[PDB]
Amino acid sequence: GSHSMRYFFTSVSRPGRGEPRFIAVGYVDDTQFVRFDSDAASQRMEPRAPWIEQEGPEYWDGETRKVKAHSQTHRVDLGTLRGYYNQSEAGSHTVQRMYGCDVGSDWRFLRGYHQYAYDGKDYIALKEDLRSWTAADMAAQTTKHKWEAAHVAEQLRAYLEGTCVEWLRRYLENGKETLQRTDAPKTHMTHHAVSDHEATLRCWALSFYPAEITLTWQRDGEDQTQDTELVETRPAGDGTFQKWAAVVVPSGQEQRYTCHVQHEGLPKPLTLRW
């Protein structure tokens, strides 16, 4: 299947309670592999998956150097942004950045991304062509110009099309046993009686990886969305995921309903019936 590598960076100012806190995390697909917390004990980039421990000291030093430099740029950004928006130094504000790349089943480049947010909303984003910028508002236009002048898009493009893809492949290879596995969902159906007049059928999918999954209800072979509830896919805590879908049906008509499960680990979709 397809794969991705993503880095997420968050800085929060808290005036009166010291300098800003910075958190950085890195993912391959749905597996976290690195972290940095500016308030944590080590003051280094840390491993969160067994395969990243194959990297030597030069990597850990370089990743630590880059992430600490990122925290410092965010500290500067927070002040710059208060000026741009004419805000006082009394409020707490949030800066967020995300970047990474997607590859297909052939592990070839699909697309890259690099985007920035301020206080929970879009600020500036690199477009899919990796050459041009989307400024969310008038304030962001000032940033667009500076990044155009400093030739940031060119540099980001080289990273996203080269380094990002190459290191993603290296990680997929180094961590093949876990990253390239497909755990098919363990599936079952429950029945709960609301009353004499109706019952709830709940279709479960457990212990699956990757997180991507589709659960659908049908009544007599026809898609059924009314009177259904579908919960957000959630982490089990052991590297696998969980999801359920439920439908409220009239008593005595349970046998008309089927749950359909689609997942990479399944050679063909499953159909469940009470």
Partner: peptide
């Protein structure tokens, strides 16, 4: 692996 772009360049 993180991007190796001079971070002061990508200040807002």
């Amino acid at each position: 692996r993180q991007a190796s772009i001079e971070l002061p360049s990508m200040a807002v």
